[PDB]
C-alpha cells in the first residue's frame, strides 16, 4: 500500500552552532536511502526512502516535492506532506522558506497555477491545544467540525478562497504564516478539474495534544504497516488523524520529510525525529 | 482533593437525593445540623463534598440541573432536601420533554449558561479541585441530553480534572422509556469522549440484587438508589478517609483506564446480606471476594463471565490484614485465569481503608472493568439501529433541531466502542 | 558519620514511622525528646497527616514534613515530571539544611516504594539531584520491591522499571525488601493470618535498626556506611543486596529464645527467611555482611562462618575468595513492648548481593515488556511530560542489568 515516503533532510550548521562545535556529520551516510547513527556512543540505522546531505539547500529539496505536488492534480485524490524534525532544524525553511530561498510551499502554488477549467481553493489553519484557528483572515475561540452522513469528517467554518493569481495564492497563505510566524500548521488547497478533485496539504509539525498526537501517529503507522505487511486503527482516538483519515485510509500518496541537525548534541533529538518517521 | 457532584435530570436528582442521605450519615451531618459524627475521622476531609459557610451549616457541593420543576421541587421539599443552597438549584421551567435534542439543542442549551456559572463558583472554592462527578440516566431529556452537554463544557474548561460519571443505562429486559435507546446512543457518544470514569448502573440488575441478594419483596426506587449510594460512597468518600493503603480518583483512573477511550466500569458491593436472617457476619475476607467476584451482585446487566477482565479495583474499608487481602485477591486471579486478561500480570489494584461505613465492621467496594460490557452496548446498538431504520421518533429530534448525521456519529462511535472492547477480549 | 533519611511515598512514610518508633524505643527517647534526622515527603496530605496526628506527632518538626496539596497519582511520570518537579525545590532545601546543621555526615538513607507515585517519581528526581550535590557521600536506598505475584498497583512494573533506570547509576547500595516474602515469613516463622502493614513494616524497621542505628553504636567490630558500599558493591552499578534477620520467632507459639550463633547464622541462609522472593535457585554469593548485635562471641562467629564456608551448598562466585564482612555490635536487639517478636539476646542481620536478583528482575522485566507491547496505561505517563523514548531507554537499561547480574556470575 502507499507507505509514507520518508525523506531525510540534514541542514547545514548554523553560524553559532558550527562555532560552538564542529559536530556536523555526526550521522554517517550509507546509500541514498539509509543513514547510520554513530555519535561520539550509540549505533543505529535509519532507513528512509531518500536523504539529502547537510550541504543541500532548500532548492534541491523542494524539487523532489515539486514533481509530487503537480502530479496530485492528475491523481484525483488527496495528498499530504509532513515536515518533522527538531525546532530550528529547517522545518520552516523547508515549508515556507526564506524570502531569497523559497521552500516547498511557494513553489507548489507556482507550479500549480503555472499548469492552470481548473478551480483552486485555499485554506490555511493552525491547531493549538486541539483547537483550530483560521490563519487566512485576521479577525477572530472554537472552530467547528462537520461530518458527512456517511461518517466522513470535514473542517467546517474554514475560510476558503479561490485564487485567480499564482502570487495571490502564496500571498494569501503568507498572511496566515505571518500570524503564526509551537503548534501544527496545515495548508490545504482543493483543485477542481473540469470532476477530478485533488487536495494538497502542506503540514508543518512541531501540551497534551502534542504528545498524544505523536503517539497516536506512531500507533497508526504501526497498526497500518502491520495490516499492509501481513494477515485496529487508532484514528478515532485522535481528531488530528481522524480529519485526515480520507487521505490516509484512502488511496493517496503520503510524503514525509524529516529535517534534523547533524549536530552530535542533537543526536538524542535526531533519533526521536527519525523514529517517528521510520526505522530499520 | 475536593469534588463537585452533578445530578442532571429527574433520575440523577432522585439518585442524588438518596446519595446525599447516605453520605451525610457517613459523615454525621444532619440537614441543617453540623458535624454530629460519632467519630472524629469523618471530619478530617469533609471539605471534599461540603463547604464551610456559616459554621454549623455544612452545605454539600452538588448541583441540581433539570427542566422539570416538579422533580426538583420534590427533592427540596423532602427530608435532606433543605440542605442544598438555593444557588445550587439550576432549574429550567422550559419543556422537560424526554427528548435528547430538546435538552441538548433548544431547552437544554439555554440553561447551560446558568450551569457554567455555578460549576465555576464551586470549582474555585478552596484547596485543590480533583474533578467533577455526574449522575444521570440514558433514558430522559435532561438526563441523557442536558447532563451530557454540561460535562462536555466542563471537560473543556478543566481538561486536567478527572470526570467520574454514574450512568443508569437503559435496562435490557424492560425499557422505562420508548425513545430510551435513542437518547442513550446519543449521550454515550459524547460521554465516551469526555468523562474519564464511568460506572454503569442497570435497572434490571439492580432489581435482581434487591430480589436475590436481598430478601426485599418490594424494591422501590429509593431502595434501588440506596444500593447504588452505598457504592459511590465506597468509591468517592471512602478514599477521603485514612487507611493503611489509601487511593484516590487519580490512583484509581491511572490503574483503571487502559485506553483513552474512557472504558466503562461496573459497581459491585461486598457485604450484601439480608438484615435479620442472613446476618451471619461472615465477612472475614474470602466471603467478600466470593460475593464481589460472582456474576450475580454486579450492578450491570452483563455478567463478568461473558468477558475477560481488564481492570479490577477492590477498595476495602475495615480493619484487616494486607495478607488475608492480597493473598485472596491473587488466588482468584490464579483460579479464574481463563477470564482475567493475558497481557496484564495483575489487573487487581488493591486498596484498603481503615474506617468502615459507620454501622458496618467490614466492607469493600468493587469496581470491575471487564470486556463483558460488550453485552450491554451491543444491545443498545441493536435497539437503536432496529428503530433508527424506520426513523421511529426521529420527528421529535429533528423537530427540536437535529442533524441526520448526529445519529450516524453516535451509532458509529458507540458501535466502534463495542468493537474496541472485543479487540482486547481475544 | 551521621546519616539523614528521606522517606518518600505512601509506603515509605508508613515504613518510616515503624522504623523510627523502634529507633527511639531502643534509645530511650519517648515522644517528647530530641530532634530526629530525617524527612517525610508525599503528594497526599492524609498520608503525612497520619503521623502529624498519630503517635510521635510532636517528635518531628513541620519543616521535615513536606506534602503536596495536589494529587498523588499512581503513576511515575506525574510524580516525576508534572507535580514532583514543583516540590523538589522545597524538599532539596531541607536535605541541604539538615546536612549542614549536622556534623560531618556520611550519606542519606532513602526510603521508597518502587511501584508507587511519589515513591517512584519523586525519589528518581530527588536522588538525581542528590548524587550531584552530594556525590562525595554515601547513597544508600532502601527500596520495597513489588511482590512477584502479590502486586498492588496495576501499573506497578512500569513504576519500578523507570525508577531503577534512573537510580542504577546514581545509587551506591540499594537494599531491597520483598513484600510477598514478608507475608510468608510471618506465616511460617510467626504463624499469624493477621499481619497488617504496621506489622510488616516493624520487621523491616528491625532490620534497618541494625543497619543504621546499631552501626552508629560502638561495638567489638564497628561498621561504617563507607565499609558497606565498598564491601557490598564490586562494581559502580548500584547492586541490590538482600535483607535477612535471624531472630524471627513468635513470642507466643514457638519458644526457642536461646539460639546459639551456629543456629541463628544458619537460619539466614534458608530461602524461608530472606525477606525476598529471590531464592538461591542459582544466585551465587559475591559479598555478604553479617551484622551481629547483642551477646555474641567473636570466636563463635569465626566458626559459624567457617563451617558455612565449607558447606558448598552456599556456592560463592568464582572471583570471590572471602566475601564475609563481620560486624559485631554490643547493643542487643529490641523487641516492641507488644509486638510478636520473641526477643533474643543476639541477632544476625545478614545482607548480601547474590546473582539471585536476576530472577526477580527477570519476572519484573517480563511484566514491563508484556504490558509495554500493547502500550496499556502508557498514555497516563505520556500525557504527563513523557514519551516512548525514556520508556524504551529504560527497557534497554534494565536489559543491561540482566546481563550485568549474569556476567558478574554464572561463569568463572
Ligand atoms: C443492625 C445492623 O447491623 O443493620 C445493618 C444490616 O442489617 C445490613 C443487612 C445492611 C442494611 O442495608 C439494606 O437493607 C439496604 C437497603 C437498600 C439498599 C441497599 C441495602 C441497612 O439498612 C444499612 C446499614 O448500612 C450502614 O449503616 C452503612 O454505613 C451504609 N449506610 C447506608 O447505606 C445508609 C442508609 C440509610 C441512611 C444513610 C446511609 C453505607 C454503605 C457504604 C457506604 C456508605 C454508607 C447497615 C449496616 C444495616 C441496616 C441499617 C439495616 C446491608 O446494606 C449495607 C449497605 O450495609 C444490606 O446487606 C448489608 C448487610 C448489613 O448487615
Ligand atoms: N512493607 C510495606 N510495604 C508497603 C507499605 N505500604 C505500601 N507498601 C507497598 O508499597 C506499594 C504501594 O505503594 P503506594 O502506597 O501505592 O504508593 P506510594 O509509593 O506511597 O506513592 P503514590 O503512588 O504516589 O501514592 C505496594 O507494593 C505495597 O504493597 C507498608 O506500610 N509496608
Ligand atoms: N435507579 C433509578 N433509576 C431511575 C430513577 N428515576 C428514573 N430512573 C430511570 O431513568 C430512566 C428514565 O429517565 P428519566 O430519569 O425520567 O429522564 P429525565 O428525567 O427526562 O432526565 C428509566 O430507565 C428509569 O428506570 C431512580 O430514582 N432510580
Ligand atoms: N538548509 C538550509 N540552508 C540554509 N539555511 C537554513 C537551512 N535550514 C535552516 N536554515 C536557517 O536556519 C534557521 C532555522 O531554520 P528554521 O526552518 O526556522 O528552523 P525550524 O523551522 O526547524 O525551527 C533559519 O534562519 C533558516 O533560514
Ligand atoms: Mg519554524
Ligand atoms: Mg501515597
Numbering used by the authors:
A (entry chain C): 61 to 100, 115 to 190, 297 to 320, 326 to 366, 378 to 390, 398 to 409, 426 to 450, 455 to 503
B (entry chain B): 2 to 44, 47 to 360, 369 to 437
C (entry chain A): 2 to 34, 61 to 439
Give the article text.
MKLP2 (Kif20A), a kinesin-6 family motor, is involved at several key stages of cell division, and in particular is essential for cytokinesis in mammals. Kinesin-6s are particularly intriguing in this context because they are up to ~40% larger than the canonical Kin1 motor domain due to a number of unique loop insertions. To address the deficit in molecular understanding of the MKLP2 mechanism, we have determined cryo-EM reconstructions and calculated atomic models of MT-bound MKLP2 in different nucleotide states.
The properties of MKLP2-MD are such that an MT-bound MKLP2-MD-ADP structure could be captured, in which density corresponding to ADP is coordinated primarily via the P-loop with some connectivity to Switch II/loop11. A portion of loop11 is visible near the P-loop and the N-terminus of helix-α6, while most is not visible. However, in MT-bound MKLP2-MD-ADP, loop9 as well as the N-terminus of helix-α4 are more flexible compared to these other kinesin-ADP conformations, reflecting distinct properties of MKLP2-MD. With ADP bound, as for other kinesins, the C-terminal helix-α6 lies close to the motor-MT interface and terminates adjacent to the C-terminus of helix-α4 (arrow). The density for helix-α6 is less well-defined, with a length of three helical turns at most and is thus shorter than typically seen in other kinesins. In this configuration, extension of helix-α6, docking of the neck-linker and formation of the cover-neck bundle (CNB) are all prevented. Strong density corresponding to only a few residues of each of the N- and C-termini is observed, although additional density alongside β-sheet1 is visible suggesting partial occupancy of neck-linker conformers directed towards the MT minus end (dotted line). Our ability to determine an ADP-bound structure highlights the tighter association of this motor with MTs throughout its ATPase cycle and is consistent with the biochemical data. Given these properties, it is thus not clear what state our ADP-bound reconstruction corresponds to in terms of intermediates in the MKLP2 ATPase cycle. It could for example be the MKLP2-MD-ADP complex as it binds the MT from solution, or could represent a MT-bound NN structure captured after ADP binding.
